[PDB]
Scaffold this motif. Structure first.
Motif, PDB file in Angstrom:
ATOM      1  N   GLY A  90      -5.473 -23.667  -5.876  1.00 24.02           N
ATOM      2  CA  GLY A  90      -5.360 -23.284  -7.059  1.00 24.02           C
ATOM      3  C   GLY A  90      -4.141 -23.961  -8.035  1.00 24.02           C
TER       4      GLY A  90
ATOM      5  N   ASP B  30       2.330 -21.949 -10.064  1.00 26.66           N
ATOM      6  CA  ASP B  30       0.858 -22.155  -9.635  1.00 26.66           C
ATOM      7  C   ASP B  30       0.920 -22.614  -8.016  1.00 26.66           C
TER       8      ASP B  30
ATOM      9  N   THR C  95     -11.521 -13.635   4.164  1.00 21.19           N
ATOM     10  CA  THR C  95     -11.975 -13.488   2.791  1.00 21.19           C
ATOM     11  C   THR C  95     -12.396 -11.896   2.760  1.00 21.19           C
TER      12      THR C  95
ATOM     13  N   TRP D 240      -8.833  -5.114  -1.562  1.00 17.37           N
ATOM     14  CA  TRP D 240      -8.993  -5.182  -3.102  1.00 17.37           C
ATOM     15  C   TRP D 240      -9.797  -3.903  -3.429  1.00 17.37           C
TER      16      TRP D 240
ATOM     17  N   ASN E 249      -9.725  -9.581   2.612  1.00 16.71           N
ATOM     18  CA  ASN E 249      -9.202  -9.557   1.386  1.00 16.71           C
ATOM     19  C   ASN E 249      -9.784  -8.887   0.259  1.00 16.71           C
TER      20      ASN E 249
ATOM     21  N   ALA F 138     -11.532 -21.229 -10.120  1.00 18.90           N
ATOM     22  CA  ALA F 138     -10.575 -21.894  -9.193  1.00 18.90           C
ATOM     23  C   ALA F 138     -11.310 -23.238  -8.370  1.00 18.90           C
TER      24      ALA F 138
ATOM     25  N   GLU G 290      -9.212 -22.407  -0.957  1.00 16.39           N
ATOM     26  CA  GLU G 290      -9.223 -21.527  -2.042  1.00 16.39           C
ATOM     27  C   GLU G 290      -7.593 -20.869  -2.182  1.00 16.39           C
ATOM     28  N   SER G 291      -7.299 -20.237  -3.269  1.00 19.34           N
ATOM     29  CA  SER G 291      -5.992 -19.410  -3.555  1.00 19.34           C
ATOM     30  C   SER G 291      -6.081 -18.106  -3.055  1.00 19.34           C
ATOM     31  N   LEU G 292      -6.882 -17.708  -2.105  1.00 19.13           N
ATOM     32  CA  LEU G 292      -7.073 -16.161  -1.677  1.00 19.13           C
ATOM     33  C   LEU G 292      -7.399 -16.264  -0.179  1.00 19.13           C
TER      34      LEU G 292
ATOM     35  N   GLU H 223     -12.728 -15.122 -12.297  1.00 18.34           N
ATOM     36  CA  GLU H 223     -11.300 -15.718 -12.339  1.00 18.34           C
ATOM     37  C   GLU H 223     -10.836 -16.223 -11.078  1.00 18.34           C
ATOM     38  N   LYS H 224     -11.002 -15.683  -9.776  1.00 17.05           N
ATOM     39  CA  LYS H 224     -10.203 -16.036  -8.597  1.00 17.05           C
ATOM     40  C   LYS H 224     -11.184 -16.938  -7.801  1.00 17.05           C
TER      41      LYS H 224
ATOM     42  N   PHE I 108     -13.279 -10.354 -12.173  1.00 13.12           N
ATOM     43  CA  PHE I 108     -12.017 -10.838 -11.015  1.00 13.12           C
ATOM     44  C   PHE I 108     -12.865 -12.110 -10.421  1.00 13.12           C
TER      45      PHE I 108
END
Lengths: 345, 431, 355, 61, 302
Positions: C339, E302, C102, C109, C105, C145, C270-272, C140-141, C137
């Motif tokens: 997500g 998705d 994370t 970013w 990431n 989520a 999570e989607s990250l 959002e993420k 951001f």
């Protein structure tokens, strides 16, 4: 049967009970020794006149002892062995008193078909023999035990509470030609201090020791070669009661990875009674040791147990003083030590 | 070190249990389907007792009968029971005086006030007592103390503030306050008699009462000398502190493990709960002490005796104990409650945090919550009870009744509402 | 300049690849470092609460704070020594406690953001928009989520539940809390605790603070706890390109146990958190800490007893080593809550190429 | 981006002036209209605020 | 106009067009009356209709899958940003067109994806699907040595029906009870299965007994196969071993009866895990490993 007959003849029964209840006596060996002593006392002092009646009395006493404490298996076992010893002699005597064919040492069809002496001395001798047997187990294991472990192999050790297992390890470690890496699982609520002690001992012995937490078993499993259990009691079908905490999960893991699972205990720990229920025989520990405070801990009901039960499917080897045995074979060994009627008291 | 006698202060805290203690003696009443005296006896045995002395006055005949029936009456026991019979209603000073008059007191005698059951080993404590005694000639008595549950909040009857030393373990001040129950007196006093001798002053409140005393031969003599001391905690300890006899020492033993004496009703309940859980290290019912007992252990802190019958499809919560000879029906929700011996439970009954004594019939479609039912008292059809409702001896609660919070019911067949006869007071019936 | 060398205890024979040493008490450093980073490092080094989820958020917050405090020099442009500063910060972090997926990431970013706006714009207009964008951001993420995941879980839970849980994963705590409060079902929570970090205990405390029926257990006590009990939930750190569960300590064993005793396991992610780095064992790269964590003899963290053990360097041939991050088997977990509502763990990098 | 609470700009496509069915679009909306619609919304909000105190005070619909 | 009525249309006939296709056709018919130009008046109504259908369902799963697919298609349609009329017309066309497609898909399956049984491989078939039967029948036209083993299906004696359909082609067959299924894995080469639906996880939503069969296959290392027409992808997750959104009771313990009335309430729908599948035969290319999930992802973005 109450304790009305035994009051001035034998008094030590109460003391034994006390020892059992509040856990003044520690270690199964010690319990066994105590039982032996009690038996000796019973023999030297009491009067008989008849043999069957005496046997019945003995049975009753055994039952009472069982009722006083169920987790003491060794005590029961020793008594059973003594009974078996008596029984054969009695059978022999009967044949002379009256004055037979068998394919093997014991027959099944003999149950279906209708079938003063110096036995006291023999009985006394039996006790002595039992004591002797109890004295040395490791000497009858090491000739088989130091043949399995090889160079550059890694051992995994759950339950370091047993005194025999440590000795077995030490004997293996003695050899200059043999080298092995030891991974030790801790066992948090019951085994921690003991585990630490074991580790210290290993260090002293000058061997490569690795202290592993209870969570870090999975990551090292690709390198694990053998699994050894520090069990406390052996049974009929193969299932064993282990000396407190962190055994079952490890065994399961071993089974999953197809890692060989060894067991070292002895035949005095071996019981002719079946472990039909896990809940009946396994005793639970204490809640106080885990977490402090009391008023919020009424809401927080904590579950913690002493002894552990492992199914016979995971364990494959049972090396004792006689030799190497299997869970599919150990029943016969028990029969060779405890007779058919002596199972139920 | 060996040969020690025991004196147990029984039948002292009557009428403290406001509904009960009128027909039958205080100590004979079961804790968990088995009498409270037995536990105490066991504790004494564990400690090291050679002779048993009990103080009886209120319903002494029954006590005597119990003793006769008990296991220690037979010659196998190391300690024999001989009861002290005294005139009705007297303080602990008077009792002490009486004891002195008789004269059995030798060396380090054990004096236990009330009934206590704890897990801590006593040999070590005894050794400590001996060593401390060996230090100086004028040493008196031992007091037992344990660490409380972080913050005190459920303690209002006896929240004693102990100012203690770390080096010698000795009490400096004793004070009782009703501050959490009634906000009238919120004050702490320190006497300046022992300020310039101790130096290390540790003021503490979070300590629970045990009332187990290891006493020297000086104590009864002291009691005889100063007749003004009727009690043993409030006046006596303070007197000792304020130098009644100059140059004397007392003990305050500190233990991290659980040790609480029986005092009230909620406290009793808490003790029972603790017993049910694995709070006490060796004290479990499945070991069977009374020999007639046939208790066995099961999963999720559940106790079951032999000859216990429970019907199919009944969802149970946490910590439940059932006595021998029980018949329980279908559709029951049982949570943190003990059921007595030979009790007959009907159908569709919701129970939460309650307590049921020996031989009680619970009627069909009833709800029981945090309330106690005494021996041979029966509940009828549709009875709804709230938190802390004590029911006395042989009270017949018949058909259709509702009782609100903290309603006490009389036991003897006087001042409090609801009586032993048919129907509890919603329509006036009784003596 | 910093500090180098001097490491406590034995180095051991096996498992030697990642940093396990370092500054615990500060002595002589460069006179330009913003203290908030240092403080964060100090916290992370001796942390007992955080577990994968909040760390990244904290880092982001710190970065935002730095940006707010940031002033452009009169001579050089906005990005000249800033990159160097960032590098230094990274180095400090690594020295303290190794960077997560994370965190990586987040760094990426940040780098992207740096590239996006070229040095030409004034100070007070650029960073005003940057901080807002970053906030957006984050909204959002992450939080959204998490909310989505919670809602997915809500519909997935049936009637009459008995659950065994592990970890200090914030999402799981949120979930359980939600169950307790707003759903009002028949939920039972059983907690498992671990030796390196008291996460289970924290979870239990949190539960108590809500008012839930709690059973409390450990890694050893598992053979008796089942003997009615169905669902098992775990907290994930990151999923690799292979599909294997690269998470914290005591999870894999629990999963195995669950598999053995009929009922499968469900894990949340999570989607990250997805990574391009390829590994299939714990030996590759592992969070290894000082053996000071395995010193205290049960009960509580601050007790300090002079019992049997209390030496590491003086002892001849003794290896006391423990692992924090583990690699769990692929086939054992069945449910993954991401997500995209619901999916299998065998998807691996379906979201990685999607970005 | 959208989810919950955040202001989003729309333009009316198809209207069913009989029972009540309204079609809306976001893609047809240009960057110029964004501020405009927001402004309109703000104005509406202000109007609503203006006609609320009155409602409160005189206790009338 | 009703979709339910349309559905109740075919019953004794059928055995040709896929169910999920008939439903789609019905939906299309429902749509092309009340003007598909407006989205406010139409999509919501469609959704309501679907909900109603769901409510009315006796024991069917794939309808939902069909409807959601249709919805997705509709959504895809209005991305061209051209005009409302032409797109609408295209949509209208795409209903009968979809039906037409199914046959072509079937043909593709029956000509390309039939190479598994060639060298006298003994087949264990359970779970009635039209596609599998087509594959079988079409395989007999190429004169290829093959053999069939039938496991007894008992919802309302469907096994008998199945054995009656194989008699028309004239092919030796034998009946096996699903209790002695563990005893016979020796001579039988491969296991083939027809599914009601494919899950989000990858696993198979099927009939009265499949999980056990799967387990047996796993034990024996003889591969497990699923052959279905590619439109049975539902947004459903069986998280545990014994959980599905089922119309029937999930293992109901009936009370102590005397006249033997309440007994036949056994699991008529069973689920197997994702790892059991070796090959999944679909018209949209030969794809298995995590293909369904990928497709789902593509659909939902998705």
């Amino acid at each position: 049967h109450p304790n009305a007959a035994t009051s001035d003849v034998n008094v030590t029964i109460d003391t034994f009970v006390a020892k059992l209840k509040r856990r003044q006596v520690q270690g199964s060996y010690a319990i066994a020794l105590e039982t032996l002593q009690l038996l000796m006392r019973f023999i030297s002092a009491a009067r008989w006149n008849h043999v069957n009646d005496l046997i019945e009395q003995i049975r009753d006493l055994g039952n009472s002892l069982e009722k006083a404490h169920p987790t003491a298996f060794s005590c029961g076992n020793v008594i059973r062995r003594i009974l078996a010893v008596l029984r054969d002699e009695v059978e022999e005597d009967t044949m002379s008193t009256t004055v037979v064919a068998e394919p093997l040492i014991s027959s099944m069809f003999n149950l279906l078909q209708k079938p003063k002496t110096d036995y006291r001395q023999v009985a006394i001798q039996g006790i002595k023999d039992l004591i002797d047997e109890i004295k040395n187990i490791d000497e009858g294991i090491q000739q088989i035990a130091i043949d399995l472990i090889h160079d550059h192999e890694i051992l995994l050790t759950p339950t370091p509470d047993s005194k025999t297992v440590l000795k077995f390890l030490i004997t293996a470690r003695e050899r200059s030609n043999r080298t092995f890496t030891v991974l030790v699982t801790e066992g948090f609520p019951n085994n921690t201090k003991n585990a630490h002690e074991f580790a210290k001992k290993l260090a002293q012995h000058n061997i490569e020791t690795l202290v592993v937490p209870d969570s870090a078993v999975f990551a090292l499993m690709s390198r694990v070669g053998k699994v050894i259990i520090g069990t406390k009691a052996v049974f009929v079908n193969g299932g064993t009661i282990s000396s407190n905490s962190g055994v079952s999960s490890v065994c399961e893991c071993a089974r999953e990875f197809r890692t060989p699972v060894f067991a070292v205990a002895g035949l005095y720990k071996l019981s002719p009674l079946y472990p039909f229920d896990v809940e009946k025989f396994v005793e639970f520990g204490g809640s106080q040791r885990i977490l402090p405070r009391m008023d919020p801990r009424k809401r927080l009901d904590t579950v913690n147990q002493i002894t552990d039960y492992v199914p016979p499917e995971n364990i494959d080897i049972y090396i004792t003083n006689v030799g190497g045995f299997n869970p599919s074979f150990i029943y016969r060994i028990a029969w060779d030590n405890y007779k058919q009627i002596d199972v139920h008291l | 070190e060996d040969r020690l006698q025991a004196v147990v202060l029984t039948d002292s805290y009557e009428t403290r249990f406001m509904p009960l203690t009128a027909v039958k003696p205080r100590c004979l009443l079961p804790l968990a389907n088995v009498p409270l005296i037995e536990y105490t006896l066991e504790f004494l045995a564990k400690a090291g007792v050679h002779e048993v002395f009990l103080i009886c006055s209120s319903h002494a005949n029954q006590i005597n009968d119990y003793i006769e029936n008990s296991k220690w009456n037979l010659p196998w026991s190391p300690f024999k029971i001989t009861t002290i019979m005294s005139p009705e209603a007297r303080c602990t000073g008077d009792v002490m005086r009486d004891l002195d008059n008789r004269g059995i007191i030798t060396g380090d005698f054990i004096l236990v006030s009330g009934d206590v059951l704890t897990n801590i080993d006593f040999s070590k404590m005894l050794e400590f007592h001996k060593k401390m005694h060996l230090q100086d000639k004028d040493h008196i008595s031992t007091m037992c103390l344990s660490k409380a549950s972080t913050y005190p909040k459920t303690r209002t009857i006896e929240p004693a503030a102990f100012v203690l030393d770390k080096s010698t373990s000795r009490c400096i001040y004793y004070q009782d306050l009703p501050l959490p129950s009634s906000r009238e007196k919120t004050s702490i006093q320190i006497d300046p008699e022992l300020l310039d001798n101790v130096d290390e002053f540790v003021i503490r409140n979070d300590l629970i009462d045990c009332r187990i005393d290891i006493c020297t031969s000086h104590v009864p003599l002291i009691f005889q000398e100063n007749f003004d001391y009727q009690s043993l905690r409030t006046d006596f300890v303070k007197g000792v502190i304020s130098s009644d006899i100059l140059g004397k020492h007392i003990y305050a033993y500190l233990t991290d493990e659980y040790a609480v004496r029986v005092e009230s009703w909620q406290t009793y309940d808490t003790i029972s709960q603790d017993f049910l859980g694995r709070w006490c290290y060796p004290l479990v019912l499945d070991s069977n002490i009374q020999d007639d007992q046939t208790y066995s252990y099961e999963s999720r802190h559940i106790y079951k005796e032999k000859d216990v019958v429970l019907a199919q499809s009944c969802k149970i919560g946490k910590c439940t104990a059932i006595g021998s000879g029980t018949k329980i029906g279908e559709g029951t929700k049982i949570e943190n409650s003990v059921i007595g011996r030979n009790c007959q439970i009907g159908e569709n009954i919701r129970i939460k945090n309650s307590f049921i004594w020996d031989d009680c019939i619970i009627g069909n479609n009833s709800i029981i919550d945090h309330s106690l039912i005494a021996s041979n008292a029966t509940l009828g059809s549709n009875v709804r009870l709230n938190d802390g409702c004590i029911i006395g001896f042989n009270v017949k609660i018949d058909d259709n009744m509702d009782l609100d919070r903290n309603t006490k019911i009389s036991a003897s067949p006087q001042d409090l509402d609801d009586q032993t006869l048919a129907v509890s007071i919603v329509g006036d019936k009784g003596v | 300049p910093g500090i180098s060398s001097v490491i406590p205890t034995v180095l051991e024979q096996s498992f030697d690849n990642s940093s396990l040493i370092s500054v615990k008490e500060l002595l002589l450093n460069k006179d330009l470092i913003h203290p908030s980073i240092l403080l964060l490092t100090s916290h992370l080094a001796h942390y007992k609460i955080v577990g994968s989820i909040p760390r990244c958020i904290a880092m982001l917050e710190v970065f935002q704070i730095v940006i707010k405090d940031y002033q452009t020099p009169k001579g050089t442009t906005l990005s000249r020594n800033l990159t160097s500063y960032l590098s230094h910060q990274i180095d400090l972090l690594k020295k303290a406690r190794p960077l997560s997926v994370t965190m990586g990431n987040a760094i990426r970013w940040l780098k992207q953001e740096i590239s996006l706006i070229d040095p030409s714009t004034p100070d007070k207009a650029a960073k005003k928009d940057l901080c807002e964008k970053i906030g957006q951001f984050a909204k959002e993420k992450i939080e959204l989520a998490d909310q989505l995941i919670i809602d997915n879980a809500s519909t997935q839970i049936e009637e009459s539940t008995t659950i065994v849980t592990y970890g200090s994963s914030k999402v799981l705590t949120e979930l359980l809390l939600h169950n307790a409060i707003s759903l009002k079902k028949n939920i039972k929570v059983i907690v498992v605790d671990s030796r390196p970090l008291f996460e289970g205990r924290k979870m239990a405390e949190t539960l108590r603070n809500a008012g839930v029926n709690v059973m409390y257990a450990l890694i050893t006590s598992l053979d008796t706890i089942f003997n009615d009990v169905d669902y098992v939930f775990l907290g994930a750190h990151s999923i690799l390109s292979n599909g294997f569960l690269y998470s914290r300590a005591g999870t894999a064993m629990l999963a195995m146990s669950a598999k053995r005793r009929n009922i499968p396991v469900l894990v949340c992610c999570e989607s990250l958190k997805f990574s391009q780095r390829v590994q299939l064992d714990s030996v590759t790269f592992n969070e290894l800490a000082d053996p000071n964590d395995l010193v205290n003899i049960d009960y509580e963290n601050p007790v300090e007893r002079r019992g049997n053990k209390g030496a590491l360097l003086n002892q001849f041939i003794k290896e006391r080593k423990f692992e924090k991050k583990k690699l769990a088997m692929e086939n054992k977990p069945k449910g993954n809550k991401i997500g995209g509502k619901k999916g299998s763990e065998g998807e691996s990098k379906d979201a990685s190429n999607e970005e | 981006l959208i989810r919950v609470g955040k202001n989003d700009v729309a333009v009316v496509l198809r209207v069913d002036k009989e029972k009540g069915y309204i079609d809306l679009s976001k893609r047809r909306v240009s960057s110029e209209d964004i501020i405009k619609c927001e402004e309109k919304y703000q104005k509406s909000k202000t109007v609503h605020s203006i006609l609320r105190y009155c409602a409160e005070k005189f206790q009338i619909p | 106009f009703n979709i339910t009525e349309t559905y109740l249309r075919f019953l004794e006939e059928d055995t040709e067009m896929t169910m999920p296709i008939a439903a789609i056709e019905a939906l299309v018919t429902l749509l092309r009356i009340k003007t598909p130009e407006t989205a406010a008046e139409m999509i919501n109504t469609i959704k309501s209709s679907t909900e109603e259908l769901i409510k009315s369902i006796p024991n069917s799963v794939s309808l939902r899958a069909g409807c959601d697919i249709f919805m997705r298609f509709v959504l895809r349609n209005l991305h061209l940003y051209g005009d409302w009329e032409n797109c609408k017309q295209h949509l209208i066309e795409n209903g009968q067109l979809f039906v037409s497609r199914a046959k072509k898909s079937r043909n593709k399956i029956a000509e390309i994806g039939v190479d598994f049984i060639a060298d006298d491989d003994i087949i264990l078939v359970h779970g009635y699907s039209r596609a599998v039967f087509s594959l079988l029948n079409h395989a007999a036209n190429k004169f290829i040595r093959f053999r069939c083993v039938v496991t007894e299906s008992r919802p309302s004696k469907q096994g008998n029906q199945l054995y009656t359909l194989l008699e028309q082609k004239g092919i030796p067959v034998t009946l096996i009870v699903d209790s002695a299924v563990g005893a016979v894995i020796d001579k039988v080469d491969k296991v083939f299965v027809g599914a009601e639906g494919v899950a989000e996880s990858g696993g198979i939503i099927n009939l009265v007994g499949t999980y056990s069969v799967g387990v047996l296959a796993h034990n024996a290392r003889k591969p497990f196969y699923v052959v279905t027409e590619s439109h049975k992808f539902v947004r459903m997750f069986p998280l545990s071993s014994d959980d599905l959104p089922m119309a029937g009771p999930p293992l109901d313990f009936t009370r102590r009866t005397d006249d033997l009335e309440d007994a036949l309430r056994g699991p008529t729908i069973d689920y197997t895990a994702q790892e059991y599948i070796t090959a999944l035969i679909t018209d949209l290319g030969v794809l298995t490993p995590s293909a369904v999930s990928e497709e789902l992802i593509k659909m939902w973005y998705d």
